[PDB]
Structures are given as C-alpha cells and as structure tokens.
C-alpha cells in the first residue's frame, strides 16, 4: 500500500502548494514492483550531481531496462495491468522527487508508443523493435541535438574570453571541456557555487580534471570579481510557454548582475524541453526539499558539528526554507542556442506546434 | 616621524597596534573605545608649552596610527573629531588673545582673505563627550525609526553582522500594534554563523522568521518592501562600507524594483575622508574557509572578501542619533563635526 | 469639553495610521469658546477653497482677534492660562481635522513671542505692540514671500507658455493672475480637478473671471492632452528633509508622467513650509476624511438623490475609503522657488538651518 502523513519541521505561513515531504527508509510495499525504479527513487531523492539533463536519460535507459525484463502473462494481454504499474511508478516518483517537463515528455512518448501498437503481436517481436526504435529516438532528439549545440557554441566564441559559469548542467561541462581540450583558445573559468546542491564545486572537480585556470567563487563574491570579464553562461531546465526561463536556483540574480554590468547572458537549451503550462511565478509550482540540506555549517557536506544551530520542531515560530526552481526575467537573457542553431528567447512556443 | 619622543611617557600604543594587526580587537565601538583611551593617556602624560606643536604633534600621531592601521575608521574619525574640538576652541582663545562677520556657521572667504589658557580641561571634557555620544546611538534612533514599518509589510535584511541594527530591529518588534515578516539573507563565506544567531535572536522574541539563502532572493522580491543595511562606516559623497558580504547584489535587487533602502549606523563610523578607491580601503579574507586540501587548491585560486562597497544611488535615508539625513546632505554633518584642515594629516 | 467617540463605518483592515471619524453640529459648548474659532471649525469640516497657505493666515487672523479681544485679569496674569487656551484650542483643531505644519511654526513662534515679553510692562501697551508685531511677521512671511516667489517665476518663465496646474493653491492662482493682467503674456492654463474636491474647477472659475484661456482636465482622461505641454506646477502642501512633496491627491502621478515625456516638475513653495520631520511613503501619515463626499452622482456638491449607492453597515461587507493626501517622489520635481531665492528639492534643509 505504501506510506502516509509524518512530516518533519514546521509547515510555515507563505509558499504552500507543492509537496515537500514520504519514504526515505523503505518499510511495508507492494510485492510486484520491479526494484530498479525503486533504487532510481532512492538516488533522485538524495542526488547531488544531476541537473535537468541527464535525469530523462536516465529514466528512459531504465525503462528500456524494465521492457528489456518485461514478461508477458499467459491469460491477459500484453497492455492490461501494463498501464496500472506505469501509474503507480509515477506515483512513486511524484512521491520520491516530482516530475520535470522532460520526464512529462518521455511519458507522453510511450503512451504515444502504447497506442501505436495493439495488442495483437507476439512478445519476443515487438519489443525487439520498440528498443530500438526508442534507442533510436534517444540518438536523434538528444545526443545529437547536443552536438550540433556544442558545434554552434564553437563558432560563436571569439578570441579572449574571461567567463562566469554556474550550474551541474551536463552540456556546459561539456563545452567547457571541448573548449579546454580541442580548441586551445585562451579560455578562463570562474565558478559560482550554490547551498542546496554542491554543482559548482563538481564543475570545478570536472575543470581540474582536464587541467584549466580555475577561480571559483559564490553567490555573495560578485562586487569585486568583476574588477576584462565578459562571457556570462548559465543553464535551463525548460522554456515555458510565456518565454520567461523556469531553471534552477542561483541564475537570476547572476543574469541581473551582468545586465548591470553591460555584457548579458547567454543561456543553452534542448528542443524538447519546451513546455504548454503558463507559468510567470516561483509560487505557481515549486521544487521544495527537506529543510536537512540547510544544517551543515559551511567547509564540506560531510562533517556534522554541534555549534549553534540543530533544531527545527522544538522552536516556537521558526521558518526555515528554501527553493530549488527559480522563474527568471524574460528580457535579461539575450542568447538562446537550441536545435535551429540560433535565436531569441522570445519565440516561446514555436518548437511546440512544430512539435 | 618616529616612535623616538614616545617610549617611557607613553608605551600603550605598541599595543594598540599589535591589536590592529592580528585582530585581537573586534568591533568598531571597542576599537573608537580603545583610541579614546589612548588620547586620554597622551592628554593626561604628555608636556605642551606651545599649542600649535602640539597639534602637528597630534596630527603626526594620527597619520601613524592610520600607516598602523586603514580599515579601522572610528578610530580616526574620534581623533578627528577631537581635533576639530581643540582647534574651535584654539581660534577662539586667539581672539582673546589678540585683544569679525559671518553669514552664517562657516564661511569660504574667510580662507581667501588674510586672517596661555585652560584649553586643557575642554579638550579632556571633549574625549567624554566623545565617549557618552558612543555609548548612546539606539535611543536617538528609535524615535525616528519605529515610523516606517507597518503593518502585513515584508522585511528584508542583509548584513546582520551589526549590534545597532539588531537593537533597531526588536524596538520595532516591541510593539504590540505593529506586524511584519521578516526575511533573512545568509552571507555564506563570512556572515552565516552571525545570520544563524540573528535568526536565533528573532526567534526568541517571538517573530515570524524566514530563513532565506543567498540565491532566493528574486523569487520573493514581488513582495518585498524594505531594505536595511548593517553599514560599518559611513563616507563623504554617500557611499558605505558593510560589515562584511552578501550586501552590494540585494542592493542592486532593491534598485532594480525600486525598494526603499534604509541604512542605520551613526555619526561616530562618519568619515570626512573620501572613498576614491574601492580596492584600497576593502580588506579581503581567507581562502582556507571555502575548500579543503592544499596541493591541488594551488590550481584552484579561489576569491573571497570581508568588506563591501556599496554606491550612494542605491541608498537614499541615514537616519542617526540627531535626526533623518541623505547621502546628498551627510557631507555637511561630517563638517560640523570634523574641521577642514583636519581631514588631510 | 464635547462629543467624543461613536462613529459610523468601520475601522479598515487596510490603512489605519490615523484616526478616521469629531464635532460639525454645535450642542453643549464651553461657556469660554470665542466664536471664530468655532466658525472656523464649521468652514474648514466642510471646505471647497481653502489648502495650505490660506488657511494658516486665516489661523493667525483668528489669533490676532483673540489677542484683541483679550485682557490681562487682575488675579492671574498675562502667561498664566493663555498657554492651556492655546493648548485647547490645538486639542479641538485636531479633533477637528488634522493640522499643517506652517500651523505648527506659528504656534511655536506664538509660544516664543509669549517667552520673550516679561510679565512688567503695561497691559495695554503690551497687545499694542504685539499685534504690530504679528501683522509684521505676516507680511513678511506671507505676502513678501508671496511677492518673491513670483518675482523668482517671472524671471524663469519664457514668453508664451503652456502651465498645467492641479489642486487650489492661492500663490499658483496669483501668480497666473500676475501672467494675466500686469505683465500681459499669452497663457494657457490647463487645470485638472478629481471627484470629491472641486478645487480645480474653482481655480478655473477664478481664472475665467480673469480672463484666461482655461482646459478642463481629468484623472481618467491625461495622456490624450500631453501628446505640447512644456511647463508643469505642482500644488505644494508641505516638503520634507528627505526631498519628498506631501501634498493633494493625484499629483505624484502628473509628476511620474512629467519625467517620463521629456520635461521635467516644477514646485512653488514659502520658507516656512518646510519640515524637519521625515517620512519616505504615502502608507506613513494619512489625512482622512468621511466616505459620505463619494455617494451621490456628481454634477455639484449639493443635490440629494435617490439611486443605489447609499450602504456602508448594510451590505455584505463594504469598504470605500480614499485618501486626501499623498506622496510625490524625490528625483522628479527638481525646480524650488521659495524665501532664499533659489534651490532644489534636493537641498532637504539647507534653509532650516538659515531660518
């Protein structure tokens, strides 16, 4: 049947809508489900690497997995309780770590794939074709689409540059690395780093990796970095149907900062990421985490210290939250590097009637 | 001028400097505290005979202690302040002595054109002026200051680092008619133990706290309608110097929304020397705080500082011990506090 | 002493700095009242012309009466009571309606006056004096100051030219009076009035009884006359020691329009105005009046109809509450005329200190 109700912390008065609960530690369950989808569960809820991109990768190499597995029943067909697990694998989900656009997109795929075959073929024929048709898929709308991304960004990029990068988002890195590695440009990198996720200290770790002058810097150090810096990149999660960049945390502020400081943003995206909901908001629908990732003071994640703070139940009248996904301004961003190679941010839905 | 004349007369002033130099002092107020004390002891010990010698003398100290120490400003501004009580008092002495039209207090021509008493007791009687005019800033502050916030307004403080501002804070929490939300910007590599403890304090006096970190600034700021700053010193033209990080964005947040910024800070931080230079006046900090690990951390230089600048056109109110004042009209007080030639030693 | 509270409508969960209501029909009075006060009470509760700069000469006219009328007893003295009369009368002002702050300065230089003179001299030769003294003082920070300030305008404004004025400020009608007859210049005078004051319809009558080429303007219809307008006056009330205009009605909106189309606000003001008080929103200190003004259809002040309007207890929950009083920003209104010739709004209290 699951788990219900326990919450930790105080509720508090304003930002209630979305869930922020659960299972954490695994007790009493339904003895049918497949347990890959349960571990991915258990990595999304307590991740630290994945931002945006690899997250639908992930979960689609695990549905090919679970097909890869899947057995037809002798009595009922091979699209019967297919469906019910399908749903009650989103219902998991939802409650381990809500759904992104992207996900949305994958299960609108494969219900579109459910519909397109009837229940009629034999079992070791259909699905041999459905791998590799949705291998296939994978090959055209995102590595692919990566490439020719990194390929536009190449072009683009000038002589002396002096960048500010924030984010654990796959295609940055990769750039970043290409532009390290087989270009042998002057390039220079300054890290900004955030508190619920340490994704700038990764892309440090990645830039040390390959061997690049790196300075790495935060949130509150941005009045005296800039005083020769010009480039500024960050990373989206989806383009909403206003045209306003639903992403996530620290990007905002950075992108205002840079207006300030003449030079703007330039801003990557994928052409699937594109999404129906009208939203112009952070309170509409929200990312919100467990109030646990805002208790280690500072240095590392892992080194638990009784200083002076260590309690959130006991305390009368105490809020202490934070969000994930932020809403930035549509008009601070300037460049948007999507699958037709350029354009403005201002196109909104243009992709998604092209479908 | 050297540390020649003074050795046995008066021997405090090595450990002044051994205070500044591996912070054993901290706070500002201890620091204006400490030179008080010190102008006290030179008053006191020292022999004169001549007055304008005694000045330049005074004036060769004040440079020394700025050459000892840059960043420590209410230390100077005392001395300055000091001066500037000897000279009034100087200038009017000569005039007994030699034994004149104003438009008004201060006059411009007069430097155009060409122009023994118990002047000591006024100068020890000036030092506790001084003194009782530190003790006090709060309660020439909340007179003014309890006007502003209302009720279901929404509050945003960066730099909770500062003890005026705190007090400030809870006189308007004292009252029972008045409500207001309060969010609080963290200021990772510097403020966050002080903001946890800010926090705390809130709490404790029974006030709707919300914690925020330093990259969820802008989706609150549809609702947002004040901002205050914990200011360490005060300049010429309008422009602060924090106490310490997190302070210069949200500024420029507020600017960007048009949010009204307030500052509170007092007369003493006051400084009638210009902040030309953002780099020479800003200290930075320590690198050993963000990153572990020392031999792969060669190739990662990593940036962080203390201090913050923060432009005259963000802020636009300085309410003081005296009164409600502007960036456009701070110069002027500084003046009738600090004397001309008293700004360059 | 009166009635005091038991008042209809209710308290507002929006806006209540200030007390909202007082007396208007007269019925057990003090047997000790002088009668122009009480006059004074019944005009001002229910007003048309008077704001700011006449009322206070009206205050001193009273005043001046009072003194006249007033004789020194032969068991108390001269200061003895005077100070609790002038202290009561404040007290039935407030009630009354709240008061200026050239008000104030009068009262606090009357409290002077009274210091100044020791209780020895002769009694009558003392009220001689001291009504002389007074009359001086109005001419001299009234009228002189009126005479300046047009002088200072006379300098200022080019040969034909096109001012858009709002509210009844008496020195603005004179001065257009001055532009009419003495000095003989082609006007055009737009006036804009709102719907519980005809104070700009007035002005308008005044200026045809003049005549003046006058425009009837509204709040609902601006944009349509600006888009050809060059200069703009503003109907100054009181100016702070941030740099801030509190003054009537829709002005901050004029002021906001003014520097958004190319020309920027001027402001006429006296060297007595000035306030050492500061507050930076129109939320600080709010001057309220009765929602009665703003339930019958307009046309004119008196008519007495029978339509829909007409419930405030009656209906399910309702509240209409407006505000007489506002507040116009800093950086906008640049131009001041006043006592010491020249400045700006910027210059808070430069005068203050000069007195």
Known sequence: PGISSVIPTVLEQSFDNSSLI?????????????????????????????????????????????????????????????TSYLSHQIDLLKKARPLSVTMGNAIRWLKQEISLIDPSTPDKAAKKDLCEKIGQFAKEKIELADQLIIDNASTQIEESTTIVTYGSSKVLTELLLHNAISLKKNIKVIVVDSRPLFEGRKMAETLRNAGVNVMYALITSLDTIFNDVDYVFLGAHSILSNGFLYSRAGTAMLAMSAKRRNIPVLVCCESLKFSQRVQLDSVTFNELADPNDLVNIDYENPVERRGNKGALLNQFIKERKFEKKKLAMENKPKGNKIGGKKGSEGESKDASNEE | ?????????????????????????????????????????????????????????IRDLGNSLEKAHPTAFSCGNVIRRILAVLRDEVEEDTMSTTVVAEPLISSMFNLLQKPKTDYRQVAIQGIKDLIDEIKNIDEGIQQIAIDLIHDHEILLTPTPDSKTVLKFLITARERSNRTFTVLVTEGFPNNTKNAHEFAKKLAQHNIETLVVPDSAVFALMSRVGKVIIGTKAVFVNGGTISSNSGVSSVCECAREFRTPVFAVAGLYKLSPLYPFDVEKFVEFGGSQRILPRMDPRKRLDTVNQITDYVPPENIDIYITNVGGFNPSFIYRIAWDNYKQIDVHL
């Open chain 2, 1 to 57: 001028h050297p540390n020649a004349a003074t050795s046995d007369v008066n021997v405090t002033i090595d450990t002044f400097v051994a205070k500044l130099k591996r912070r054993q002092v901290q706070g500002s107020y201890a620091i204006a505290l400490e030179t008080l004390q010190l102008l006290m002891r030179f008053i006191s010990a020292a022999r004169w005979n001549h007055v304008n010698d005694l000045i330049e003398q």
């Open chain 1, 22 to 82: 659960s299972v954490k530690e695994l007790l009493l369950n339904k003895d049918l489900i497949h347990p890959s989808i349960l571990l991915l569960t258990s990595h999304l809820a307590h991740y630290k690497i994945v931002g945006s991109i690899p997250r639908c990768i992930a979960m689609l190499e695990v549905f090919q997995i679970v097909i890869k597995d899947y057995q037809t029943p002798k009595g009922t067909t091979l699209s019967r309780n297919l």
